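Slack export, channel: ligand-projects

TW: morning all. Re-posting the request from yesterday since it got buried. We need the structure predicted with the small molecule present, not the apo form. The ligand is 2-oxo-3-(phosphonooxy)propanoic acid; the SMILES is in the block with the sequence. No rush, but it would help planning for next week.
GE: picking it up
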Amino acid sequence: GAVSTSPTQKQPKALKPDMNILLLENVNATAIKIFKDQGYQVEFHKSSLPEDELIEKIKDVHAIGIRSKTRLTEKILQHARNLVCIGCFCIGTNQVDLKYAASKGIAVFNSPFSNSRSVAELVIGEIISLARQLGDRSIELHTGTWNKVAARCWEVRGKTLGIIGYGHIGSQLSVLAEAMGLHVLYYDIVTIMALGTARQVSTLDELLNKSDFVTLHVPATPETEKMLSAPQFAAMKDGAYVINASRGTVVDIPSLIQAVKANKIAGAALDVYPHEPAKNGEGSFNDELNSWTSELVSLPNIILTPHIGGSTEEAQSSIGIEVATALSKYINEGNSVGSVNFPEVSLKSLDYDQENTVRVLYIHRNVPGVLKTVNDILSDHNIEKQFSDSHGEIAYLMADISSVNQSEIKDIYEKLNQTSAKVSIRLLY
Amino acid sequence: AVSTSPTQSFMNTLPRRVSITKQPKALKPFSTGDMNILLLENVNATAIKIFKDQGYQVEFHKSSLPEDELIEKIKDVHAIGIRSKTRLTEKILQHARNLVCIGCFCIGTNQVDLKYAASKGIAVFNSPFSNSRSVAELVIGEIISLARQLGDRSIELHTGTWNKVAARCWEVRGKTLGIIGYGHIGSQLSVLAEAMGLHVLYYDIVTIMALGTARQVSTLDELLNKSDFVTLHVPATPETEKMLSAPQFAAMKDGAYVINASRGTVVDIPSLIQAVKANKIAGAALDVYPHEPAKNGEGSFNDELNSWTSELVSLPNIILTPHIGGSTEEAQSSIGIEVATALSKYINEGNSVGSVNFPEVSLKSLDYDQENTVRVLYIHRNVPGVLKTVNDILSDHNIEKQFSDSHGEIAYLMADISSVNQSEIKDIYEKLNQTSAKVSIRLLY
Amino acid sequence: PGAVSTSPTQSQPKALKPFDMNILLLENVNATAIKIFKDQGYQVEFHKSSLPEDELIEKIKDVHAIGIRSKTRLTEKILQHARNLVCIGCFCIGTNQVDLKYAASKGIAVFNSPFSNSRSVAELVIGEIISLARQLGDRSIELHTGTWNKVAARCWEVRGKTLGIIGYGHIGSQLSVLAEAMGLHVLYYDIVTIMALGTARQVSTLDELLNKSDFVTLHVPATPETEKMLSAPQFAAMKDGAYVINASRGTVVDIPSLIQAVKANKIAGAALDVYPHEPAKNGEGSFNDELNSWTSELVSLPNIILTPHIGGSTEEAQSSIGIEVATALSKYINEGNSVGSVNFPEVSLKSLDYDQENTVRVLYIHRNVPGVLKTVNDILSDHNIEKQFSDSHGEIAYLMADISSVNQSEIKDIYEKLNQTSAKVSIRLLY
Amino acid sequence: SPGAVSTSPTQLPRRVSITKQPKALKPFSTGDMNILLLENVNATAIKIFKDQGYQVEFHKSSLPEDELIEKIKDVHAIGIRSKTRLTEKILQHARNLVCIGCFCIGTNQVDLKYAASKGIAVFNSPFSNSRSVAELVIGEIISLARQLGDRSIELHTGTWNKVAARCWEVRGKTLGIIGYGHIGSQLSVLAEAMGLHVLYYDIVTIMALGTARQVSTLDELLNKSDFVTLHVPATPETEKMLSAPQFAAMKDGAYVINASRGTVVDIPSLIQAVKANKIAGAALDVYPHEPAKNGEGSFNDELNSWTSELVSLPNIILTPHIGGSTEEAQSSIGIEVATALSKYINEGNSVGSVNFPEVSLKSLDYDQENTVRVLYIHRNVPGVLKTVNDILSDHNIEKQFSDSHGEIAYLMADISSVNQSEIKDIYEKLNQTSAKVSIRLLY
Ligand SMILES: NC(=O)c1ccc[n+]([C@@H]2O[C@H](COP(=O)([O-])OP(=O)(O)OC[C@H]3O[C@@H](n4cnc5c(N)ncnc54)[C@H](O)[C@@H]3O)[C@@H](O)[C@H]2O)c1
Ligand SMILES: NC(=O)c1ccc[n+]([C@@H]2O[C@H](COP(=O)([O-])OP(=O)(O)OC[C@H]3O[C@@H](n4cnc5c(N)ncnc54)[C@H](O)[C@@H]3O)[C@@H](O)[C@H]2O)c1
Ligand SMILES: NC(=O)c1ccc[n+]([C@@H]2O[C@H](COP(=O)([O-])OP(=O)(O)OC[C@H]3O[C@@H](n4cnc5c(N)ncnc54)[C@H](O)[C@@H]3O)[C@@H](O)[C@H]2O)c1
Ligand SMILES: NC(=O)c1ccc[n+]([C@@H]2O[C@H](COP(=O)([O-])OP(=O)(O)OC[C@H]3O[C@@H](n4cnc5c(N)ncnc54)[C@H](O)[C@@H]3O)[C@@H](O)[C@H]2O)c1
Ligand SMILES: O=C(O)C(=O)COP(=O)(O)O
Ligand SMILES: O=C(O)C(=O)COP(=O)(O)O
Ligand SMILES: O=C(O)C(=O)COP(=O)(O)O
Ligand SMILES: O=C(O)C(=O)COP(=O)(O)O
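GE: finished. pasting the full token output, ligand included:
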């Protein structure tokens, strides 16, 4: 061949609009501290509220923080007079009418990826635990039985981990798994840049053939529904292990149960199930919830967990920071980036030295001529910069205008409030 | 001024190579025929393969033998492989006519009368460090398990209870692991623990070069103050006996974790039990106890064995394991290789290096082209004039090289002598066998 | 004693066309740039050298985008004849060769490649450290003149030696990693407190660095503070037989002080890539006493490596400069993306899907005065504005707007109306 | 069942050594020890010897055969380098000489066979220069890659030639290491650190360091490498192993680096390849013929026919065999060898000796009072141990080791319960033995 070119590899201005924050479902303390440090008055609750007690409280509330339990429907959101934004201190947002919340000009924020590390660590733990049958050993000794067994108990070093879904969690797991001396194969429907010395594989069937531990880290889709069933378990190695901390639908439990009973699968660890209790309870996990529970809990070397993949102080702490920060930046700067129901819109902060500069936050219906109106109303002042984006029926305009005194604020606000397309207005000075 | 850098203390690397060595001479025993290996207590298959490939006739057993059936078998046996259960006392070893060496396919050797075995010229070998990785992995698993209360969660769901709890459940990342004893296991654990994102403090009675970004601490009390997880990897000594007790638990953080896969004596269980009940210790994992069953059994772990068992098993987030730290196919496999190899090299080359009861003695192999060269293996009483006698008896032949070392009352001489034909072997053997100091002789030709 | 606590928080798009494109490339811009432009259909004129102000003005009349380097000077004089010029590409760090203020006022966005050369300068310094440490230059020169001088005296392994990095920027920090990899201790002085990479240690005073370092290398910009910052007093503060490496700026080292220090056996060697005065062209006898009074004295000294500003002179560097800038121009021309521009408001919008038929992108550079958006948004009122962004850079400002439901008919109209506006500086419509 | 989960394939940090402080053994007779050091042995060696009480004579240069013979009469240990030739002629006058230290790689300057027959153990430092050669090559790779030498030479003659054409970042380039030994392997790590891919051809299969890949044929390495560097010994197989056919197998604009041996590269082939624009540059530290002393006009057509043609070429780095020419290298050579001699003199430890049986014994504790160490070099003939072990029969031999090296052999023995009285006796008896070549007693 021939030697050829190697491959290419100022303190900010504090904006003013008391602010009322209501937090439900035991939001982490980190969230509470962030809000209080900004002056906001914070109401905290360890549990949800009934539809009655809530409506009375959401009348005056400027920002509500919820989790998965509190359902915010059109019914309960219509009484929200001053509500600026909703914080989902969790992954899910189904508990909120996004479409409606949008139409009233309420921005919703969540924490999708705060639990990645917590699920990865759990899987390392579960790999070692299954490999050595810790659960069984500890249960035996607790009932007074001494069963010292080395047969088909393994060092994880030199074993192969099959990661189905190389996302946020799958990729973090990859690094840890290599660190613990595992070979890492991964099947994904998308071609993804491997971390460390991991190897992407063309077919799930190849992964199942060559892996000792198979773990799922995929979302819920028709493709993932019962994607691990009799045929897949038949394609896996004799005495291999199945780990599902992904979704309750992705594994066919009765197939797994047969495979385990047939001495084909040496053990498994499930964090998620097709049907799960709505609350913590004593007789919650039974044949009424899942027909096969009593059969499943009969099997040896099966680790069962009540959806604790992201159940850590770290996870809840960073969820508290991520979301509390998101709401704070939306309230203080109108920053709607990362919003799940809103146009994503932001502008560089203003310097302290930019005296007499107001920020216009104008959520409006996405129809022609609205900017014509607004920029006419602001024509008397120089627009340093502005940004407008649309999300279906709704749209959001941020504009920084210079040379406004206390006098002209009241005027500009009133004029914008009287506009045809207006859904909500805030002025930050 | 710009000066010579300090010379690298001992920071040189070893690129392992297929080393073109002059093919070595395969030595065979004299004055004997076929070799008899007896293996008890279900020694790994790797050991069996190694022995058969040497020509040895192998007798295998999944269990021990009674003192009766054993004495009958050890009469003819050239090498015995045992584990912890089979006790080889003066009583049963005195009947051992042909016994060359004992293999302890395990850490412990207490099950063997070493002093006596020595006096009869029997070399004992074991596998002290074959289980390091297996114990290290277990501890990573147990750290995560306790951190998240997996055991409890899985037990709840099995009894039908759904208890999703994040309160005082932790990511191990950013937490501190306190390693008491930075030996073979402690140091392997250090690397894994950093990989899992843990800070690693370690207290040891000896100053030790840290691996990765681990930090040695002056006092145990410092480690206990600053650690989230405390794990012991120390031998059994009067200094380690109940070294973690009420005062130590009192020095540890609120909601800290105690892991003992070291020795059954090193933790004061009733202090731990108090500490756990006092909400001081959030969880613990024990693999070892002051008293343990001798056999697997369903009623074995009870108040008769340890007064506090029924109280201990009453506590939440306590992982209990029946001494499985090294209970893996890998561990047993490499134990089989390490020890089987050790016995093979002792039987075939007289190599006694790594022996626990013997002088450690070896010589470089002989080349294939060194025809008519015999290796004299002469275990003898460690008294003056013995070498005078032996080297007199060999005087007719050139001694290429010899090595003699002493271990108290007993001593071992290896000697390579050149220009010996079948005729002179029988003579040299007989003369050496009739010597005053002789305890045992073998000639390899 | 304490409590177990929560750990600390962790440390197809639519191809838009203007409603032939002419690229002029001067000063031997890398081929990567040429290929990027041609693949987009643009007609490319290439030249290995600059043009004279006469031949240039004739060519820049029709040119849509010009790519230059440091030599070609684009003044008000030559830019005023630029009829169709959309953007300027500086395929190099410097932009002083361009009247930015003027280029801005005509609505011309200027782009450059500031950090494309980091790796190339870092590698050079590793090379020069080892070379000075062992006196390679001297040894090879001796043997070439027939002299055999096998010398180990005050020749060093770099392992266990200390590198003093003055200025811990893009280059300083890349150098830090390599230097540790080669077994060097890394001290660094900076005027700002900066997070160390690997196991490097920041030092409070330059004086401390100079006291404790074996090799001193500068990676600082040109400022009044850096001007001759290494002089007699600094060399006096350095270790006996220490080494000075300057691939930063020509002004930052006092050459005559260095020369005295070297002659006084205080500095064992040095490597300079940059000088107060440098030739404008490659030539024989270009580097002489006419250019720098001390050259003939400097080139008289042993263990001094001199290089003609080659810090970033590698196929890699030129290649990635070609990609970075050609890409920048392409995205500005094709999408109006002005992010990373040195003279312009930084403005961009997410690309439009292939499925977004009948959507036009309005690129409206205008004077930064009140009422302009009022006018523009009035003129566009007949169509829904999906999204728009306007930012200002002093006297000038830039508005990007995506409008939906426009047929060939209405484009011509909207263009004309916007072109007739009071504040207009330049308009393009992407359809 | 595609397969089954099976046993994974079967595969301590440094600690303050808690051993019973060892007994410092002193020679019987040898009242004061005489060390002679020639050819400017590093100061580290001098310090080691003086700190042990030895009287040290130092010289920056060699001695003439006359001045030397007069000095080697009384000398207990001599330290030399490559220049001082120790022949049968000059060694026969050596009355008290215990050991020779070669503070360098080569030992050809010493009659080993003869030195052996007189019972003189010779030691050297074979691998003390590994790091220094590895660093040089990294430097030379970057220098060739960027043409530093040329650039600096141009500017010195007043020429400003700013060139990026066929000048490279080393990152993403391939280094071909011919010979993955001590130097080759250290170079591998550094080269990866500098972002280079590392192929290596060796005649022996060797465990790769980092992410380096061993290659089956030299021809493969030459095809795929951007920089080729040799780190091989001098053998008939290596003689002119890189010639026209090899350069023809290399990439257009590739680079050749030889800091191995002067015989391994065919210079006139390289010169043609360079002139044919096939090789973009090269760096040679070694040549078929080299001056014996530093001098002006030493490197000329009289020494190598092609010099004047070679020095005419662009981007060729030439060095006068400086691969190991660093203060570090000389320092660690001084330590390695001085230590070796000290341990041989103090403990009879002959491990690492080039002409001797390699023999050693664990040190004796301070608590082992009245234990003498017998060092008995003797002719390798039957009945010698019979004699020695007879002579020592009155005492318990704790341990002894005897090994043979052709005609000569070496016995170390630790004997217990000897008082000053019995030492003089045992020494005399052993000195009068038929096979004796030399005896020392350490108490
Ligand atoms: N157990 C818990 O408490 C817990 C906590 C957090 C997240 N999770 C869930 O675990 C899953 C993984 O989360 P994440 O953030 O890593 O997800 P992600 O969206 O970041 O990554 C998922 C990956 O799976 C791949 N994928 C999708 N469908 C696939 C298919 N049919 N076959 C193969 N690969 C497919 C995608 O390409 C993607 O790379 C999600 O369902 C997530 O909500 C569980
Ligand atoms: N649970 C199991 O099945 C299992 C398996 C193998 C080993 N072990 C046991 O675990 C322990 C560790 O094994 P290893 O092979 O790593 O041991 P080791 O000898 O390698 O390590 C012991 C370390 O502890 C240090 N030490 C000694 N006394 C100490 C004290 N009082 N306080 C603090 N440090 C002290 C030593 O200096 C050394 O660093 C041993 O007791 C071993 O028998 C248990
Ligand atoms: N020789 C070449 O061919 C070549 C090529 C590219 C860049 N460079 C030049 O090298 C220099 C470093 O490049 P970079 O991209 O890393 O720069 P950079 O802007 O990333 O970093 C400069 C650093 O120097 C610090 N600094 C400024 N003034 C200082 C002072 N008086 N004392 C100490 N520290 C001070 C700054 O705080 C900053 O951390 C620049 O001048 C650059 O133009 C040279
Ligand atoms: N320039 C200097 O001042 C200097 C300094 C030290 C060493 N050296 C020389 O450089 C070489 C490197 O020394 P080292 O200590 O690394 O040597 P080494 O013995 O550690 O390694 C040499 C390697 O070459 C391999 N080899 C042997 N013959 C071969 C062949 N024909 N083809 C391919 N591989 C072959 C061997 O298998 C071995 O891996 C030696 O010749 C040494 O004398 C030069
Ligand atoms: O964080 C998640 O995964 C959820 O959406 C569950 O909601 P929660 O925080 O448990 O109320
Ligand atoms: O398990 C080990 O390795 C031991 O040290 C003792 O156990 P065993 O005798 O093999 O049951
Ligand atoms: O700024 C740079 O990158 C330079 O080296 C000077 O300009 P150039 O690219 O060489 O024309
Ligand atoms: O390469 C070598 O080390 C040599 O043999 C040269 O000997 P020296 O140390 O230069 O006297």
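GE: first-pass observations. Chain B touches chain A through 61 residues (CB under 8 Å). Residues 329-349 of chain B form the longest helix (21 residues).
TW: perfect, thank you
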